[PDB]
Design a protein around this ligand. Structure first.
Ligand code: EJL
Ligand code: EJL
Ligand code: EJL
Lengths: 257, 246
């Protein structure tokens, strides 16, 4: 029944609004220019030093440390959203942990696209905007932590998904029965099946002119997994080069693999 | 009129049956008898065996924590079936769930308790009151005030039809801190209260002032919750898992 799929799409959207304070709709209105919501822009070291006045160690390290703290808050938001996905909490506790461990970063890069356009990224709940050029201009190896995220984002954003869409897509990501170390693959796959059915109808209803959008979205999961693995490789470099740099426990446990 | 009140009661009963896998009726049958006996946990070896069938004290309290999170999702779903709830301001919904869940967890837990112990694992097991109370401090004191609450609550002899409305009344509390629009909430709760009153008059004609007696139990519930939070602050003085439970 179509109607049970619609109801589940509605529930997931509602949870998504409750779990994530900065939605794509809000991010786009800020980026577009929809007076009231105008961000301060950080394109250089002086603008960055100014940003601390009107927005909420070393500069490159201060920035990277900021991202990692933000990434932790995002993991908490994603974690709260996951608990809302029907069946998730009823799964074996080790599998819940495993789904989260492999899922959360893919979800982070998916939603981070919402806060990006080709020249920059929203920061600090959208009060600030840090330019893409400025992030590139960071001393090695920090120069190119964000670049693969921009490249993914520009392309992902051409799909034109809205938040209702994304709510379902991120649920589909989390409930992937091919995560390494899963004890009970079957219960997970049965939930994903249902979520995939919900996503399929949603995209057909919400984007009736956009052909094979469902398949086009699913193929993007290939791009997400690539971004994760490259980011891990970059993180291994940093720890060795910046022996004075402190990585957040949560994030360390996630990356253990 | 009275028929809108019956419509609402029935709507809530049907949703409560859909949302909660283990009903009071089903739990009473298993506690009195009616088919496999639940596996009983009365001792340490019993527990050890129970895990295979289906610090000990820490592992038991973590288990109640995991179940509590399951119950939050069941309660959340049920709340969405209450007429008016989804039309409320989003922040207010989250606020009503945030403060309402604990009161409901303990209300429904009474359903699974008698004076001698509590059903666990969806009624596949029975953990004895004595075994819970034997647990080293401060764990031994955690379940006991719930049992005390439950013996008195259960004396009202509510069924699932009654409880379904009562639960909704608890969710639509206008006095939760942080609420943005208290009006439509109180307005829904007034209507839920009307349904609860007529439900109790029809379902229990002989039980005088059962409605008032039930509302007085809200004092007992909030005290339990406040007392739980207190013991939880004490427990904090002793990774991805931490996050899930929060
Ligand atoms: C004042 C703003 C606070 C923190 C962000 C500041 C600069 C970061 C610049 C761009 C990033 C945009 C938003 C922040 C959130 C995620 C971006 C990141 C990403 C990753 O590279 C993951 C980093 C987590 C880690 O440190 O491992
Ligand atoms: C102060 C931290 C600096 C920058 C980001 C601050 C807030 C991000 C804005 C809103 C967050 C709330 C809900 C939206 C959820 C996900 C979209 C996102 C995001 C990010 O902020 C990027 C984090 C991604 C990463 O760490 O890679
Ligand atoms: C070990 C995780 C708990 C349960 C397994 C999942 C579903 C079985 C359904 C109910 C079992 C309930 C509790 C078993 C664990 C600890 C006992 C404690 C307490 C409670 O029994 C749960 C109270 C929540 C509620 O039913 O409202």
């Amino acid at each position: 029944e179509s109607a049970d799929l619609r109801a589940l799409a509605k529930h997931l959207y509602d949870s998504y609004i409750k779990s994530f304070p900065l939605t794509k709709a809000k991010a786009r209105a800020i980026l577009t220019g929809k007076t009231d919501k105008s961000p301060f822009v950080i394109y250089d070291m002086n603008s960055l030093m100014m940003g601390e006045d009107k927005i909420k160690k070393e500069v490159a390290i201060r920035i990277f440390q900021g991202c990692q703290f933000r990434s932790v808050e995002a993991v908490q938001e994603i974690t709260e959203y996951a608990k809302s996905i029907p069946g998730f909490v009823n799964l074996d506790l080790n599998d819940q942990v495993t789904l989260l461990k492999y899922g959360v970063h893919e979800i982070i890069y998916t939603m981070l696209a919402s806060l990006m356009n080709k020249d920059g990224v929203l920061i600090s709940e959208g009060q600030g905007f840090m330019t893409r050029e400025f992030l590139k201009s960071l001393r090695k190896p920090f120069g190119d932590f964000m670049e693969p995220k921009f490249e993914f984002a520009v392309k992902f954003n051409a799909l034109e998904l809205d938040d209702s869409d994304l709510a379902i897509f991120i649920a589909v990501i989390i409930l992937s029965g091919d995560r390494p170390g899963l004890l009970n693959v079957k219960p997970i796959e049965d939930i994903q099946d249902n979520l995939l059915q919900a996503l399929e109808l949603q995209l057909k209803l919400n984007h009736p002119e956009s052909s094979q959008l469902f398949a086009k979205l699913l193929q993007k999961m290939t791009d997400l997994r690539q971004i994760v693995t490259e980011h891990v490789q970059l993180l291994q470099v940093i720890k060795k080069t910046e022996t004075d740099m402190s990585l957040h426990p949560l994030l360390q446990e996630i990356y253990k693999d």
